[PDB]
């Protein structure tokens, strides 16, 4: 398809790598070195105390937080011999999840989805993984992630993570990331219930805006989930040299989990689509009531106004001098017409 | 025969720009025979014809250079899309200019046809005005390596000028989208819906134009014809990357405007309800009142309210009574 070259963009010097993003507040480097017996971890600010982990024997977890420090990213990639296009993809957050297989490392792009209750905003953050022979390299934007359970598992020798190699560490990271989508998709559920209750009770424009934010958020979730499932499928049915044969069933289980992730997001999508039509039915019902009011008023008071005008015209010849001058008779005629209209409306159950 | 489809026939001229490492020599003439014999010049020759509506000259020029009459059909075929065709003795490219107006948001387009031949490049334009003044400056004043390279580098420079103008057009579209974002979300206005429709239409036109240009540039560098030469492939590849960078922004802008339209059209039913509420409120509190006026405005004798306890103030107080009960009836149940 291509030869994996730099993008040579406009209005930007040729050798420039640019952080595409919004977060420029936090920078930290958390290293987590572990083995079957030993274990150590340390936060860091300078990168040079982290490079000597490229050549090692224990499985190491290097967590670079804050990719607006393009200098740190380039230094790490140069030490680990990572292709500059890969660093450019690391620094570009406007992309879907990916999986690229190289002769010495795998490069996985994933996305975390923090969801806030107020303002109903779906926030996204790119997290990038590079699996080298003994090191897993992680790049993030902000502080905060979903990998605390893994950290506890290393810290307390829980699970089986410390017996196995960096392939199992990569699996654990991807598994935790995928499992957080279940938290997301069960958070959305009660919000859907609240929307349903509100549309049953109070129809307004804010409900419309909320429902359409739900629709856009679910479309974005689908656009993120599908490439994620394809990435896991590629990690599974390709058997790269870096991932051993005993790690494949775990990736199979992650793919399985992604299945019902997508299934339940589809169910949420069409149930909120139903809430939309419930809304339209309710608002049309209210408009029907008010239009019934208006048409009842008009139906009664157009003909009576017409009759008042007719008997109120000024011609030289008038029917006044008959039927006991007919003024109470005329009023009784108007009353009879109004009563007939009212009972006809009530006959058709017209509110 | 040859027929011109466009709507620009007001002017016509021919501009020539020959150059070499030694010197440059330019013409601005009107005769086809004068510009005819530059084909065999060893130095690069740039030929510009500002009027293609004059089918006579555009028919005459292609006969000498040896271009198949299908490209003659396409050059005067204004209603087209960007495309590139390779031939044995030449290559034929069709591109689009774009003129935008801030005061009147209409996206005007002019078609440009490029014929790269051996040591000669032919340009065909509809109206006056182009995007190649910087290339003229480089040619006149030795501002780059454009003088040291052959006609393929000229084709590069002209396509690069076109994509630069596309970048400027993107800047203007960005300004318009920035204004319309607030003008739509913050306030509703009658002009804003039409403005959003026009913005969507212009972005559709841009999208329909840009992707063929991307395919054209990919054809230019990826599969190399003998004309382009190997040294010029990196340059056309850079232009292809610029086209990618334009297309991505076009998609993003289209998504933004589509979201604006979706919100506006989702906010319609309750607006209908509110207008109906206003009309029903107005009609309910006035039609019976007009009836009350008319019923005592009848030409009936022996009516009881001749002067019965100040009949006119009594009627007016009655009007006030029904008005008050009607207005409080709505507020209790909240219409």
């Amino acid at each position, epitope marked *: 398809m291509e030869e994996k070259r730099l993008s040579a*963009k*406009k*209005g*930007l*010097p*040729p*050798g*420039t790598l*640019v*952080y*595409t*993003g*919004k977060y*420029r*507040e936090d920078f930290e480097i958390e290293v987590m070195n572990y083995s079957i017996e030993e274990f150590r971890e340390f936060k860091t600010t300078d990168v040079e105390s982290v490079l000597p982990f490229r050549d090692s024997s224990t499985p190491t977890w290097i967590n670079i937080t804050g990719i*607006h420090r*393009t*200098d740190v990213v*380039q230094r790490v990639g140069e030490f680990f011999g990572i292709h500059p296009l890969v660093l450019e993809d690391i620094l570009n957050v*406007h992309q879907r999840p990916k999986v690229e297989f190289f002769e010495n490392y795998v490069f996985i792009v994933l996305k975390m989805f923090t969801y806030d209750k107020n303002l109903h905003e779906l926030e996204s953050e790119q997290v990038s993984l590079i699996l080298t022979k003994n090191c897993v390299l992680m790049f993030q934007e902000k502080i905060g992630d979903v990998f605390d359970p893994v950290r506890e598992r290393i810290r307390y020798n829980r699970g089986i993570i410390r017996k196995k190699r960096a392939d199992y560490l990569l699996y654990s990271l991807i598994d935790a990331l995928v499992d957080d989508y279940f938290v997301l998709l069960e958070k959305i559920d009660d919000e859907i219930d609240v929307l349903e209750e509100e549309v049953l009770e109070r129809p307004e424009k804010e409900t419309v805006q909320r429902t359409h934010q739900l629709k856009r958020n679910l479309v974005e979730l689908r656009k993120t989930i599908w490439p994620l499932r394809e990435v896991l499928s590629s990690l599974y049915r390709d058997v790269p040299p870096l991932i051993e044969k005993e790690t494949v069933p775990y990736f199979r289980d992650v793919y399985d989990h992604t299945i019902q992730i997508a299934d339940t997001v589809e169910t949420f999508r069409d149930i909120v689509s139903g809430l939309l039509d419930v809304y339209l039915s309710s608002v049309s019902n209210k408009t029907n009531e008010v239009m019934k009011v208006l048409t009842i008023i008009a139906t009664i008071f157009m003909p009576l106004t017409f009759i008042a005008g007719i008997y109120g015209m000024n011609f030289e010849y008038m029917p006044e001098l008959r039927w006991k001058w007919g003024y109470p008779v005329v009023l009784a005629v108007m009353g009879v017409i109004a009563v007939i209209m009212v009972v006809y409306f009530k006959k058709k159950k017209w509110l | 025969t040859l027929v011109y489809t466009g709507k620009y026939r007001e002017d016509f001229e021919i501009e020539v720009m020959n150059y070499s490492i030694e010197e440059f020599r330019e013409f601005k003439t009107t005769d086809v025979e004068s510009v005819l014999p530059f084909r065999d010049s060893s130095t690069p020759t740039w030929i510009n014809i500002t009027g293609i509506h004059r089918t006579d000259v555009v028919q005459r020029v292609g006969e000498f250079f040896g271009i198949h009459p299908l490209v003659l059909e396409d050059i005067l075929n204004v209603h087209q899309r960007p495309k590139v065709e390779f031939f044995e003795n030449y290559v034929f490219i069709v591109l689009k200019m774009f003129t935008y107006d801030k005061n009147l948001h209409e996206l005007e387009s002019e078609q440009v046809s490029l014929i790269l031949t051996k040591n000669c490049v032919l340009m065909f334009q509809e109206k006056i005005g182009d995007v190649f003044d910087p290339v003229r400056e480089r040619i006149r004043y030795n501002r780059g390596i454009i003088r040291k390279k052959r006609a393929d580098y000229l084709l590069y420079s002209l396509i690069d000028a076109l994509v630069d103008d596309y*970048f*400027v057009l*993107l*800047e*203007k579209i*960005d*300004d*318009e989208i*920035d*204004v319309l974002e*607030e003008e739509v979300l913050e306030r509703p206005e009658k002009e804003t819906v039409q403005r959003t429709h026009q913005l969507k239409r212009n972005l559709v036109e841009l999208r329909k134009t840009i992707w063929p240009l991307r395919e054209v540039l990919s054809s230019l560098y990826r599969d190399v014809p003998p004309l382009i030469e190997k040294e010029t492939v990196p340059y056309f590849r850079d232009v292809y990357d610029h086209t990618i*960078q*334009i297309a*991505d*922004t076009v998609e*993003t802008f289209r998504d933004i405007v589509s979201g604006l339209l979706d919100v506006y059209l989702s906010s319609v039913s309750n607006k209908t309800n509110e207008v109906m509420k206003v009309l029903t409120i107005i009609a309910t509190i006035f039609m019976p009142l007009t009836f009350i006026a008319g019923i005592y405005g009848m030409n009936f004798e022996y009516m009881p309210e001749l002067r019965w306890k100040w009949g006119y103030p009594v009627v007016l107080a009655v009007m006030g009574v029904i008005a008050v009960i009607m207005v409080v009836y709505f507020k209790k149940k909240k219409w």
Partner: antibody, heavy 126, light 107 residues
């Protein structure tokens, strides 16, 4: 920790020359762009030149173009401004700044200046 | 090139009231506008970039926004540390220019 230090500023005869040395510590000048901004006494800031050390890209203002010269030294982690054909209207305080690129749209990029040096005063008179 | 016309040329205000400084562009500067604060004898400090993004460490009192071609800097609760000169700077092209400045003093 990240700092920029300027030197070379002084009193120079008109039509003269001097070189300004921008000593950068705490970062590598290869990964960032370096700018030169001056400020005449009592007048506002004005941007002079820029250098992208890794790629060699240089840009100049018209008031100094073809008359100034910006350069970089990767080994010494410093950037220079050369001032030739000096006029008396080039007298100012010369700042060295460091900028990063950020993303707005695909076609659009902007850069902002984080850190500055305390500046050097250049006088061109007598 | 591009001219940044920054108005007003100077301003006097108290502590607590909203201060708004406006900058207009000659032609389209697609959100590439940054705001700086300079105090006499000191190097300028960065406040806003991308016309709406708060630089790290800057107080939340400072705010920026764009409406097409014109840009505004807003200080919601002016404080004694805010009395300085404010500049608008564009970086849409490689030849980047500043505004003329705006001096905010005590009413």
């Amino acid at each position: 920790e990240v700092q920029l230090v300027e030197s070379g500023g002084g009193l120079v005869q008109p039509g003269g020359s001097l070189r300004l040395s921008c000593a950068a510590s705490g970062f590598n000048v290869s990964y960032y762009s370096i700018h030169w901004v001056r400020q005449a006494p009592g007048k506002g800031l004005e941007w002079v030149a820029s250098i992208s050390s890794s790629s060699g890209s240089t840009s100049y203002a018209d008031s100094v173009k073809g008359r100034f010269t910006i350069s970089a030294d990767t080994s010494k982690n410093t950037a220079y401004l050369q001032m030739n054909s000096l006029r008396a209207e080039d007298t100012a305080v010369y700042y060295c700044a460091r900028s990063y690129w950020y993303y707005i749209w695909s076609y659009s990029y902007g850069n902002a200046m984080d850190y500055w040096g305390q500046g050097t005063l250049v006088t061109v008179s007598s | 090139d591009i001219q940044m016309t920054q108005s007003p040329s100077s301003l006097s205000a108290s502590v607590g009231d909203r201060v708004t400084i406006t900058c207009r562009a000659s032609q389209s500067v697609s959100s590439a506008v940054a705001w700086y604060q300079q105090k006499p004898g000191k190097a300028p400090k960065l406040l806003i970039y991308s016309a709406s993004s708060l630089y790290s460490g800057v107080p939340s009192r400072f705010s920026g926004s764009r409406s097409g071609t014109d840009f505004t800097l807003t200080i919601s609760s002016l404080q004694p540390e805010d009395f300085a000169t404010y500049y608008c700077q564009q970086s849409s092209s490689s030849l980047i220019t500043f505004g003329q400045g705006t001096k905010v003093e005590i009413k």
